[PDB]
Structure 1
């Protein structure tokens, strides 16, 4: 139920393929009408989840460099896919920027994102 297009609550979209070997591969678009706002993602998911009501654990990374832009940073999302008629991917994320050592204390933001199969 993971392969396809997902939308967060803030205007981002990604398309992912959940491969038979546990791979997640796809593209994350940070801004809707922008073609220079697309980035590679890559991650892993549990390809044999429990069928007991529990979500399917997964995670992925986007390094915020493409052919057009580079923020010198990367986000990782860690979360779980929850199926059903209102399917969701519920995540928490860490965004680390490259810094000098003196700035390392402020290198990492934390937050949370919920993705749905239908636009907000």
Structure 2
């Protein structure tokens, strides 16, 4: 219930998610940045029996019917309930690269999600 809903990050990206009773996370992601357009499928897992924030993570491969950025982002964070529910994350964005360029394949950042 807590997790399920629409969330936006500081970049203006949109995350629509449903938390299943089995610890599954499914929804779609709409990105404000990068080489993207439209929504992308997301899938993740969360602690369906948390103690403290709720640990969760999700992935988006930046490929839909319109574009392919040949990359994937994984968000690792925790959900924090209250008046102002937030999802605090750290993410890794890996681009498919040649062996020579593999060293600079992964970006790291942090996103804060606000529930609408």
TM-score under structure 2 normalisation? 0.94
The 2-side partners of 1:115 and 1:29 are apart by 13
Task: Find the counterpart in structure 1 of residue 48 from structure 2.
Answer: 47
Taking only aligned residues, the RMSD between alpha carbons, in angstroms, comes to 2.2
Assess if the C-alpha contact under 8 Å between 2:72 and 2:93 holds in 1. Answer: yes
The 1-side partners of 2:6 and 2:101 are apart by 36
List structure 1 segments (4+ residues) > 4 angstroms apart after TM superposition.
32-35
CA deviations 1:5-51 (Å, max 9, x no partner) are 0000111011100000000000001149999421000000000001x
Cα 1:111–1:33 change in 2 (3 A) is: closer
Moved more, 23-32 or 57-66: 23-32
5+ residue gaps in structure 2? none
The 1-side partners of 2:33 and 2:99 are apart by 35
Cα 1:27–1:45 change in 2 (3 A) is: same
TM-score under structure 1 normalisation? 0.91
Task: Find the counterpart in structure 2 of residue 62 from structure 1.
Answer: 60
CA deviations 1:28-87 (Å, max 9, x no partner) are 01149999421000000000001xxx0000000000000000000000000000000011
5+ residue gaps in structure 1? none
Q: Are residues 1:92 and 2:96 paired?
A: no
Q: When the two structures are aligned, how many residues end up with a matched partner?
A: 115
